[PDB]
Nucleic acid binder design. Sequence first.
RNA 1: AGUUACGGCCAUAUCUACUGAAAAACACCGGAUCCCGUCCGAUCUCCGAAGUUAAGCCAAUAAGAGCCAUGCGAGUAUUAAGGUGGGCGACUACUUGAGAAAGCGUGGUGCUGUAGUUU
RNA 2: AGAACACUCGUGUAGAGCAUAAGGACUAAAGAGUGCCUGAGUGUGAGCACUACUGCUUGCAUGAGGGGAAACCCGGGCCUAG
Lengths: 156, 281, 167
Amino acid sequence: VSSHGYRRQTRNLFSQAFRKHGMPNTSTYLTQYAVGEYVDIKVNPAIHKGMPHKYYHGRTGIIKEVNRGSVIVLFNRILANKTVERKVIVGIEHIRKSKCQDEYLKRLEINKKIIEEAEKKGEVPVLFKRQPKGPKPAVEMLMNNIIELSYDKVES
Amino acid sequence: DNKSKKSYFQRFQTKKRRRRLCKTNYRRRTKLIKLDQKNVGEDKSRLVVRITNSKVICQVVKSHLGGDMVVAQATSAELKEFGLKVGFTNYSAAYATGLLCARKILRMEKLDNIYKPKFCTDVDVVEDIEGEKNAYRCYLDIGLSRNSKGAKVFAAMKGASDGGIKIPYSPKIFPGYNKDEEFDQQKLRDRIFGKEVANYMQLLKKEDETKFKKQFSEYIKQNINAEDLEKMYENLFNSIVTKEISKKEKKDYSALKKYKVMKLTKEERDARVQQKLVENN
Amino acid sequence: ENPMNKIKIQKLCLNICTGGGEILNKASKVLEQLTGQKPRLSKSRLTIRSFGIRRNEKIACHVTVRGEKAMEILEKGIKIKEYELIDSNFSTQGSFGFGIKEHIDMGIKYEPDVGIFGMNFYVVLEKPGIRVSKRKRVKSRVGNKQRVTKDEAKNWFVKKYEGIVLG
RNA sequence: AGUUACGGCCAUAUCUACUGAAAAACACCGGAUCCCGUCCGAUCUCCGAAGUUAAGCCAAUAAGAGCCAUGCGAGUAUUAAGGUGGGCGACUACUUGAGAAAGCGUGGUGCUGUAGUUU
RNA sequence: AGAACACUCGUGUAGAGCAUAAGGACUAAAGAGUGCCUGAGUGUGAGCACUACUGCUUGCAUGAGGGGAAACCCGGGCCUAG
Ligand SMILES: [K+]
Ligand SMILES: [K+]
Ligand SMILES: [Mg+2]
Ligand SMILES: [Mg+2]
Ligand SMILES: [Mg+2]
Ligand SMILES: [Mg+2]
Ligand SMILES: [Mg+2]
Ligand SMILES: [Mg+2]
Ligand SMILES: [Mg+2]
């Protein structure tokens, strides 16, 4: 039978990668955080204070409050077939800034131009949506340089 | 045993570059520079003091993501502008360099007229004048050098304080400290204005005039005597506070690129090997 | 000839081993006379019943001399060994060693309660620049140009004392 | 264009042999009176310039070891969905999709930020 | 003075140690020494582990508090049990 301590089953998780042992780099400490940013959790096994519980490893959430050397992040979780919000305390050594909003922020920068012109000249924005890839395109071909294919390889 | 098998090399992890070179202590650096997440707009300045066989360097440095930025710099070798002839790594030359460094800063920030100089007459920390702008703030970075009573790094630090910058310090480190008694500041003043060396010069002339000439040849060439030092140092300090050194000019030493060696091409490397086989047979 | 690049003594190491009680005090007083230093007592690495040694028990005293004082002692000792050494006594590293059975040959008066002890002498030779491997900042390994080799150590001995190195 | 002080990413930067280097630096180097610390002025701390490019740091060289990239291995190994497909089983063919690794070939061998100094 | 006594020089990515299972962590240290101290303080909040008890993480205020030149750290034991 299995046990139920705070760091159960973390032999693979919570171990350093090959040729990457030691303390964190300066960039870790010089990064500034703000309320409302999206942030991503990855535990560093060498630091023993401010570690989250291993369920949260590799998950992304939103910063709710900022303190001297730690952050409070909001998560959601299913328990007993219902949704529950959870507020997780994490030290700054175990977090990295998330990339999940990157494309959306670029798109907002384009929208922000159009939405002004749409008051002056038009009435409503064109709004620049994405579209999924359509059907295969048409082609005009010169028809020299033909290559033949054959079952010449007998494959003993 | 170890270095005899390939696996030794295949599994090895290198230290960071400035650690291999024995120039930086990363455990110390991180405690010194790490950001406080609530004090937004705080921008801590390190005072970096380093001592070479030739000279004393003071730099004021701010740590930013991507690389440290130098705000201002001063070097004991520049004191030759104000007529310093001798002892560029002396305890006095340490103090003088810290003084110079401070003034250059407070001029850029325009605090210079508010926070006046004060030549080594107390052991208190610099205090914010009411109704005016706050003092410029810094912390001391001594690197890999040891802390002990009367180390030259602390002389430069007192220089900066006397110059008007706010550094927190404890008097435990200066000559003239006593374990359970008031501070004897005349001993400190004595060293700043060079008494320690005068007292050595005076001794040797009674002991061994041959050894004296060997030990102090450079001083002799300047016709300096043990008696002259206080006047020398008083003038030097005043001049630092009073004057300003001329700006540096920029020049293209680009043409010295003639001296740079260039690596062999592939074509050459191959022919060279070919010839080596033929020379051997 | 090229200055630098010339051999010197960097260290002479002297040790007496005498496992037991008041013997170590009696011994220490000898080292305190032969050289103007107070020697360092050393303790047993293992426990060995046959030799009469408990672990962490003091068993020996040593002192390391440098500079001018080293020259006097070495000359004083090589005389006792009559300027005769064997090719066994030299290392691949530029160092050499010998032993003496009777401390009174170094000249000190007997005093019958103190006793008779032997002593080990070990000598380390050098050329300038070795500091590069010992200083705190920018510590690095020395060049092959600046080591001392087995042949050089023999040549120096022959030259300096006119001794005879037997095969 | 190098160097030097403080750095960023942490081997294209490591490890082993050899060889070069104008200027200014960087060093080795000469002492212990003091402050400071040793069994020991070796290390650490202080006060110095008589020497020296031998060393370190920097740079080149090597059908070098190791690291980094790419081509091939290879539509190969394994795998999602499907049928009144096959086989006593062990397991395996086909249809619509996703898709490797080791080895071995070929090329590389640090790049950059702020300030200071040197034709 | 021996297989195995003390002292040295060169190599040495851990082949050692870290009181007590097993795993993880650690190299100018968290290991081995040396100095000083009793923070193994005092009030009162918010949370994490399926969360009552329990264990841990973290906020603000105070001490004629500690260690350190200082930045920093400390309301038990390197982390996961007693
Ligand atoms: K069981
Ligand atoms: K253990
Ligand atoms: Mg599980
Ligand atoms: Mg030159
Ligand atoms: Mg003395
Ligand atoms: Mg010396
Ligand atoms: Mg040369
Ligand atoms: Mg606690
Ligand atoms: Mg704890």
